[PDB]
Paper text:
TRPV3 is most abundantly expressed in epidermal and hair follicle keratinocytes where it plays a key role in the maintenance of normal skin physiology. In contrast to other thermoTRP channels, TRPV3 sensitizes, rather than desensitizes, upon repeated stimulation with either heat or agonists. The TRPV3 channel, like other thermoTRPV channels (TRPV1, TRPV2, and TRPV427–30), is a fourfold symmetric homotetramer.
A single cryo-EM dataset yielded three distinct conformations, TRPV32-APB 1, TRPV32-APB 2, and TRPV32-APB 3, all of which resolved to ~4 Å resolution or better. Strikingly, two out of the three TRPV32-APB structures exhibit twofold (C2) symmetry (TRPV32-APB 2, and TRPV32-APB 3), deviating from the canonical fourfold (C4) symmetry previously associated with thermoTRPV channels. The reduced symmetry is conspicuous in the pores of the TRPV32-APB 2 and TRPV32-APB 3 structures, where movement in the C-terminal region of S6 in diagonally opposing protomers results in asymmetric gate arrangements within the channels. In TRPV32-APB 2 the distance between the M677 residues in subunits A and C is ~5.7 Å, similar to the diameter of the closed gate of apo TRPV3 (~5.2 Å). However, in subunits B and D this distance is increased to ~9.1 Å which is similar to the ~9.3 Å diameter measured between gate residues in the structure of TRPV1 bound to double-knot toxin (DkTx) and resiniferatoxin (RTx). However, TRPV32-APB 2 is likely to be nonconductive, as the narrow opening of subunits A and C constricts the pore. It is thus possible that this arrangement of subunits represents an intermediate state. Interestingly, an overlay of S5 helices of subunits A and B revealed that their S4−S5 linkers contain π-helices that originate at two different positions: at residue I583 in subunit A and at residue M578 in subunit B. Since the π-helices dictate the angle between subunits, it is likely that the differing positions of S4−S5 π-helices within the tetramer are responsible for the twofold symmetric arrangement of the channel.
Author numbering:
A (entry chain B): 276 to 462, 484 to 508, 518 to 756
B (entry chain C): 551 to 688
C (entry chain A): 689 to 756
Write the structure that this text describes.
Amino acid sequence: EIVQLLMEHEQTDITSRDSRGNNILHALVTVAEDFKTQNDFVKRMYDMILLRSGNWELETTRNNDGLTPLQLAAKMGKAEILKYILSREIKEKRLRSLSRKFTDWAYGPVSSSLYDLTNVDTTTDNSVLEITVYNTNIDNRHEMLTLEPLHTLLHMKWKKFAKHMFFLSFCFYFFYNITLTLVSYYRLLGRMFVLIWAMCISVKEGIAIFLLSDAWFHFVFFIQAVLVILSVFLYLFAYKEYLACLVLAMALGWANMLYYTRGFQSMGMYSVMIQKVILHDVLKFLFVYIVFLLGFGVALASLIEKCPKDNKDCSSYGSFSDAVLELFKLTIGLGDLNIQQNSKYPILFLFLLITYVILTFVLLLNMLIALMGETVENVSKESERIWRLQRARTILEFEKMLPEWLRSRFRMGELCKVAEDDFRLCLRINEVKWTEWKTHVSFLNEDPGPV
Amino acid sequence: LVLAMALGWANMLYYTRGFQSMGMYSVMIQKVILHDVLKFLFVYIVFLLGFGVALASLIEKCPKDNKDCSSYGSFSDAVLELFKLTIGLGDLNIQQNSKYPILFLFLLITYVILTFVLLLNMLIALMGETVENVSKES
Amino acid sequence: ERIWRLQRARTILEFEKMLPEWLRSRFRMGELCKVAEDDFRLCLRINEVKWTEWKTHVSFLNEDPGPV
């Protein structure tokens, strides 16, 4: 009521930017915490204020940061307000311009909604899409992407070219790794292309990391390329030994191949499960297990510190590294076990060695508990939100790798006419609604024909 | 003939599908082998090749005509040793017929770790859907 | 999680008991505040936010909402 009173006065200045430069709309976007908290009233005030001023000025302006209110809601973790903005259908014939969501035709429950892509597509300097995707500050990007226009843009771009580009890069990397394997196993015409590709990806990864738990793979590729260039430079020198590092990069290369399983749906979910959760858990598991290994191997080597007496087979665990290897054998089940000689207390030796096994077993059971507990519900949704998010990030990466003229050629979206003699980009999406029935007063085209 | 025998005794499982308990049993077999196991097998074959090439490369050091000295000599031999290891039958030991025991051991340990983690993720992906969808779908 | 929080509180109290009087006096959490009728007592501050329950705030110690 007070807002109505204020807007009715002619002395009022709706367009007044504060010291920070923000309009009313930027401010409201700075406040939309979530639905469970507010009960979604700020959206109502946004709508009312727009309807009080039939113009584009408020949404067009920028703050001192240089961002529209839309770009601002994308910058923050603000979804409901964005869902509203990107989907506005105003029945008022006079204020039809302000709407972004348009119904081209509604013969019945089937109808083609015509969304708008003025500052949403990647054509602008900073699109809503790049803003949503290239910020890890929010931790809500999945709820941001599931919206109609952005979701459809991403999947249509994947349908057009990005699938081809990803398969292309995967084929190149597959060829590269096959060449590396052939070179290493049997150790010139192929090695040249290998080295050139290595230097290319080295420069790429270096630049990307200079620009920089998602970017780990960049460091992985960088390490692989560094190892490859190092081994190839050392090869020129008369050093047979240096070549030993080659297989290391090869092994690392195969880890990089895991990255490309991120593409397929099932394989992608499986790969994210490989990457994140298992890292988080098994890294701590491995750290504690290694400290156990050291703490027990030192003791065992100390007990068996007794002299061998011209018998090395009697000196099992004799070397500390040898003792660690023997416990590795034991936990896996490789090492022939027996009551060790050269121990003043063989019974206590065996007791400690069995306590090792019991501790390792209960430790395995602990990690199993942690994994099965996390795997219930958090893993599914988290892995989906990570997978689709990384896919969209890489889609935009491929799109940025391109030049201007090709992008122009593609031209996602169709130019279309909106009332009041306007022409703008739009996106057509066919959708059905059985629950709601109504006379479609707001329709762009009388004839529901597709063409 | 013998192959058929094997396949034949894999086919009796079919008739187990009659019983309700054995019915859900066989259907769980089918669903798991279709969904989770193929991923494990494929990517594990990938790792087998990626690591066995390197193992054979290091084992390229000639044993002077002694297959026992330079274990992991043949590529298929190294893969068989890796299989025994993942089952635990092998008799591992630092091979004097090698230029680098340190790198050999580190790579073998990383292989074992990766295999264990991959098996573990197979188990996790199983448990994830285990509770809700399995019973009803079966 | 319950046992974790519980044992962490136990440890915190143990370490607090390990300290001397003067360091404890230094790390005293809370602040003196005037409540009512020449009453000065210790208090703990928590800034809270509520978007649901709307009401004209009648009862308040300080007229100016400034932190200091």
